[PDB]
Design a protein around this ligand. Structure first.
Ligand SMILES: NC(=O)c1ccc[n+]([C@@H]2O[C@H](COP(=O)([O-])OP(=O)(O)OC[C@H]3O[C@@H](n4cnc5c(N)ncnc54)[C@H](OP(=O)(O)O)[C@@H]3O)[C@@H](O)[C@H]2O)c1
Ligand SMILES: [K+]
Ligand SMILES: [K+]
Ligand SMILES: [K+]
Ligand SMILES: [K+]
Ligand SMILES: [K+]
Ligand SMILES: [K+]
Ligand SMILES: [K+]
Ligand SMILES: [K+]
Lengths: 489, 489, 489, 489
């Protein structure tokens, strides 16, 4: 009822889907139906893929600097529409305006900016073999690739995925989550306005079981990049493999440790603790959801953590003074409620919240109190499993080696971090932790330059940094024989 | 049996399997039983993993130059044992002595020697952020990895997969083909003698549906590297993915095009085409089994191909004089003979060969004659489908753009080559061919420095070159904060 | 007095010199005094050094992306002002407007644009030694650097030097040629407008022997980058070295060979010969001034050269239809004509040109006719010595090995080139040519991605490409001991 | 004389010099004439260059792995002869057998080993411009290069220079210090026994004023690599420049700061300080000769230094229990004693040593007792100038920002270090120190992987690491035009 019915974006304009079917997008701050959103048919996919083939041709026939200028011109617009975009993402996701205005488009574009400047730096190798022969390599685009996004940072992830793919000279078809489809359509508009050729960035709306699956199976898509949960990642990765051997990147979940050592400043430690857990209503995949403190310091540190959780400003995401909103959807609110009832039953001590909050307006939304449990153990459902909502488990320990031992004991391997003032301990410990994203006296900063991804079952491949751009090309080796050819026959 | 029963190799020695079962390996030249070989159990797979976990720790704790020296010592033993290992390879595969003595151990050891020099050159990055903070990255081992071998180049594949795996500080569990298990066990012996710690290279014998599967499923194995057919590679990759999101490299098959432009040296062209079809009796994955010839040279090209094929010395692979041997097995002979009958039924013109060679002793072995069809068309089964025996398909074309479009019109993408004396044409054509391994005026050479692998359904990732070494490490990113930390709560 | 008096540029504005001394800059087409220009004092050099030390701290304290955005903005302004700056370059140099509007500012800004995008890509290395020790490297700015410009491409050369220097976080003091000081001053206005901090790009006008030399001697300057003649470069590099051991870059002169092989299209070959000799009236350092023609092609080639030279449009460089202007000055013209008379005295055969053009208003300018000598020999002064005016020397050869030996028989080694259709010969001949800048079937194009500089006495170091950015940083190696320290004492 | 007359080494064997003149080499421990040594003539220089030019061709014509194997064999030989080369180095330098057996040959061979593995990793670049054009680079050998060695580490410096030069495809002519000519000749024998072609490594003995000068001036030598004092480096670098514009590398002297912060453990800070001043009897270029201690820790730091200095085992370098021998020469001893009197005369407090040791046999040798001065001031001659003997100057500071400003206030910039247990301080301070070689909580280790050399007036270029090998090649860019060529004429 609130916004007009959303169409598929294919070949540089909106087109009518050919399914007959729609879904609704719902503002989770207060249940308001934000839009009717068309669902792509299997033949819509065929059409988007044929569009991308003919478009990729156009874009890759440009010189590298012509592609860099078009991408930079898309970065200018994103800076220019920062606020109007952040307004939309907030209605779509329930995330506070104080974060969307300041992070989502700001880091989305930071990454696109970084890669736009690197287009001319994509190079191959030359290797001499003998006087009469040498080899050179070319790094070529994959062709049409496909991205499949999450609902927690919708426009940002849409940028972090398509920035490298387009910079590497690929056409991308993107599928936003059914939960949050709005700003990805806006990104498509913008890119077209930048001069990005028709077909180079198509968007298909719908569900993971339908349009997602049809994207992983399509014989003419050369790579799948996916962001989301581990159990889904497995199905997604198996589908791309068994259909046509696609190249893949997966950014998945984690249950990341944070080790406070006994020499840490505890004020620092608590700030890091609270920042690692409550930002975006605990809806960040890298969150430091397992907090280790020394036994000799659990009382003091539990003091400072409650002190700070007490003053989180829960409120309207629309409000400028809000720093904590609702969760992305109601379905997801009761998934989190289901872990908090799990923690309670398992004798885990509750230190604050745990209860859905409805006073005045709050009841028309999906609001959960920031929740903290303490005196936890390793076999607890809340300690072993990923929650994806504002729930912090706190664990006591007696020595360094034990803390590291326990930090590593997981199928997960996304992030990890340490709080100490000692040079030796800081490096020594971090070298021993099994995560791809490691922090020393900080948490959460993710620079365009820093490769990020998971160890173990949190990922395959990486995002950001120079490495990620390379992995959106394919290597062709060329051997040039300048002398005689010898045959045995 | 010609030899003693072949046992599993775990932890620097031979150990009894716990399956209660074996299989035979057979000499395809004469049907002699070479050995009985033990099948690994599920619990033997668990034993091999526990052994690799412990051994990898010891290997990783050495210096870079200590690992380098150990691997260079293994190279030295391989050069010394070249002729003996070549004689065993010839027994197990049927490949002529003239090939195993010059190619298999020479080039397998060339790659180990390459990576041994490169151990000290593996390095991370460092990226300043501001005065108060920087990042560094570590390239850490993956831990335990697994390789699954093919039967065309048994010891060479074992070396090409284990060399970068061990140079990068990992342990590998290797599963040789059931068809060809013998030389892989000898390579495990040599790594041990060289100084490689117990458990760093273990060998498990048995089948793909059983031991290949238990390897690709295991939660503690971090990466799978597999060489084999495209259909099986699809199953392997999907199992590696859906079980624990393992990293993967796939080297698969193809139907690789050779284009002979009308300005080519025709004798060079025919030398290349026969080398690209008939080396190792037509059982090389990169073979150029679609040969495009211009309409005006078809008759002259055919006479040149016929002349070379008539002087091929098919015989006993123990004779130094033989340059063309039996096929690897009797089942594989049957499949090839079926492709030959298909060619005939669909009315391609038989230029030469086209049957089993059975005169005298040859009737004991699995010998298929060097076979050339001509007047082929793109919809024929012999043209569409990988045969992996000695069958060349010659296809007529009229213009350059048509040859390249027909060359590229396949689900495969392993290799491609062009023959032309024109500078512009050579590079222009090669830049448009969609394959990872591209040759100008030559075929088949695969230098240690040159990364090799498939586009499309012919592979995922690469082997050889500087790049492949980087792909047996995982990136850890470490942000160091030296300043104040800010919290928004 | 076409323009008002031109002042020193120091600290983000124009400042009065303290010398009491000025020079006149003149238009070479007509003798018109364009402007009075101030000469920097020795006190003014000091003032510019202190200004640069302070501005560099400000520029290096910014983030990498802060610096990128500022240089990208300078590029936008250069793009807008292309036609204006070209007009002033034409006034100052005599170059046709058809060249300055297309080449000079276009290719100068291309290099700044290239480097602007790479600012965030500059990284150190990280090397693990053992569990308890690792090394990291930093690539830190050099600090204050100086560039000394040549008169043939005044603003392009100011761009090619300042761009990597600023991108790598340095401040630069630039000294334009006394012959062409006008466009360097506008570049400094542009940098300031884009937001480059005060003192990061300072410009000092006056002589090489006074102000050029005070810069090369100053103990706070870390690197000198110079473009000009070989004999001057020896003096400059010698002074930079003996004063305070500076880093140096040197882009010097040449006598570059172009080999025309007997399979070339003679229209392509003659098009390449004339471009390689007569662009910017023969005042390009990389010019291909020794043109090797096979005995069998000599007559037909000379006819095709004579034909192009007869339709060269020598005239007023303000006329868009001019493609061959006057030389930069009358002194220079005098030198050139002495070379021509030497060619005549030494019995070389004049194909065409060989005289000053004095008819109509041309007597007011420094115009020399496009000149071609043929029947030349290797011991001729016109063949041995760099002329730097529009004078081609044609030399006959009989075999390839002879042509290559003769091409390499020089103390110079800036550029070289070959024209042939043959794949094998193109690469093999170019691999044997002792020059840093090599062209197959083309001449003169110099992409921002392509490192360029001399072998032998034609240079030290390179400009452009990835490599050059690296060479405006200094390496610092940091070893972190995290374990015990052992003394033998 | 102890040994036979030493001859020039040219073309894989010893040859007679043609000067008619010798010099003597003296054992500094007892004053015995170890050997008469031939002075190379101007003409002997020409002979060595001509032999290098021919030998370089043969060496560069081998494959990368053939050169790798030959260099690795030279490593093997150096390992087996470690003890014998060590004994001869002790004779020539006076260094303790405890040092020469463990450091000099071990680490010189470590660097040779490192580069031997890297020969095959030297690659150029590939850059696509458009469909019709691309560029590739070649990294080619410089040709003939020269190394000029110092007397403090004669065989180690001979190997650190020749290793990357030979690894990159070059021949080197090497001139050892007149003070220490013996072990360089032995290295030339070992290279030839390893299979290095005749002329690839030639050795010329004699003075820098004469033979070093003849090498720096020779027009066929392409690069000079020099180790020694700053003032001599300035002359060598200027002569290399003005003669033929050679490439250069300079490793020169220093007055390197060691800053001990207040949290430092004083047992550790004192072990680092004595190892930083008295290893090699004070004769290491990177020595931490200015020791900054906080005012409030001065008293206690001084006690711990004296206690370690008192137990230094000065004695006969041929006795294994010696860990402190004579200086390299009597002239050098005389120079160190004049700095000692400068120190006294200028009223620095003598903490210990400060005279020559003349008891019994020592009076026959060149022994200066370990010396520490304290209460030193920044203007004192001992604090400003490089001494190159065993003289530590201790300096009080009061605040961090200050200690870092004092450390930096020098024209030198070779090494620096900090001792501190705090994380933020260790890294923040090192980042501000203007030195190429930086140590945290350690001193003196120089891994083969780690690029080392001087900031400011302490050097140009680097030795060791990946980057050094890169600087023993020249870049050639090759533009391949595959389409039409456009002329303006
Ligand atoms: O320490 P340190 O005393 O060895 O430092 P240094 O006096 O700078 O000498 C280091 C090396 O440089 C040589 N050298 C001296 N002057 C030279 C010159 N003008 N040209 C070329 N080489 C020269 C030396 O000659 P010597 O062989 O005379 O030591 C020695 O081999
Ligand atoms: K929604
Ligand atoms: K994984
Ligand atoms: K077999
Ligand atoms: K693929
Ligand atoms: K002028
Ligand atoms: K040079
Ligand atoms: K001596
Ligand atoms: K310097």
């Amino acid at each position: 009822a609130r916004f007009e019915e959303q169409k598929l974006y294919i070949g540089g304009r909106y087109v009518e889907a050919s399914s007959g079917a729609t879904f609704e997008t719902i503002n989770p701050a207060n249940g308001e139906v934000l839009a009717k959103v068309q669902r792509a048919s299997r033949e819509d996919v065929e059409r988007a893929v044929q569009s991308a083939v003919e478009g990729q041709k156009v874009w890759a026939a440009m010189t590298a600097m012509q592609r860099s200028r078009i991408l930079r011109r898309a970065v200018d617009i994103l800076r220019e529409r920062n606020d109007e975009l952040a307004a939309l993402e907030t209605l779509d996701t329930g995330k506070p305006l104080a974060e969307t205005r300041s992070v989502d488009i700001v880091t989305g574009a930071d990454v696109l900016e970084y890669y736009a400047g690197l287009v001319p730096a994509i190079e191959g190798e030359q290797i001499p073999l003998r006087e009469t022969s040498f080899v050179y390599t070319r790094r070529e685009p994959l062709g049409v690739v496909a991205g499949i996004g999450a609902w927690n940072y919708p426009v940002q992830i849409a940028l972090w995925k398509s920035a490298p793919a387009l910079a590497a000279g690929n056409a991308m078809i993107f599928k936003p989550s059914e939960v949050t489809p709005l700003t990805a359509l806006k990104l498509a508009e913008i890119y077209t306005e930048a001069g990005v050729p028709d077909g180079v960035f198509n968007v298909l709306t719908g569900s993971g079981r339908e349009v997602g699956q049809w994207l992983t199976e399509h014989p003419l898509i050369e790579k799948i990049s996916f962001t989301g949960g581990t159990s889904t990642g497995k199905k997604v990765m198996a589908s791309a493999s068994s259909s046509s051997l696609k190249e893949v990147t997966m950014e998945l979940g984690g249950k990341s440790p944070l080790i406070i050592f006994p020499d840490a400043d505890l004020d620092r430690a608590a700030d890091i603790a609270v920042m690692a857990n409550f930002f975006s209503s605990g809806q960040v995949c890298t969150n430091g959801t397992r907090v280790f403190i020394h036994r000799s310091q659990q009382a003091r540190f539990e003091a400072k953590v409650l002190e700070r959780v007490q003053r989180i400003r829960l409120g309207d995401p629309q409000d400028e003074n809000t720093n904590f909103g609702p969760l992305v959807s109601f379905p997801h609110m009761e998934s989190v409620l289901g872990y908090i009832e799990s923690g309670k039953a398992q004798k885990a001590r509750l230190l604050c919240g745990g209860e859905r909050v409805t006073d005045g307006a709050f009841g028309k939304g999906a609001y959960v109190a920031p929740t903290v449990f303490t005196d936890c153990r390793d076999d607890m459902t809340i300690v072993r499993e990923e929650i994806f909502g504002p729930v912090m488990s706190i664990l006591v320990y007696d020595d360094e080696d034990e803390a590291i031992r326990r930090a590593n004991d997981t199928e997960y391997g996304l992030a990890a971090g340490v709080v100490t003032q000692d040079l030796a301990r800081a490096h020594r410990a971090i070298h021993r932790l099994e995560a791809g994203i490691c922090w020393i006296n900080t948490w959460g900063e993710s620079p365009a330059e820093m490769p990020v991804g998971g160890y173990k079952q949190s990922g395959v491949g990486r995002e950001n940094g120079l490495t990620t751009l390379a992995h959106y090309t394919r290597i062709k080796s060329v051997q040039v024989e300048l002398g005689d050819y010898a045959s045995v026959f």
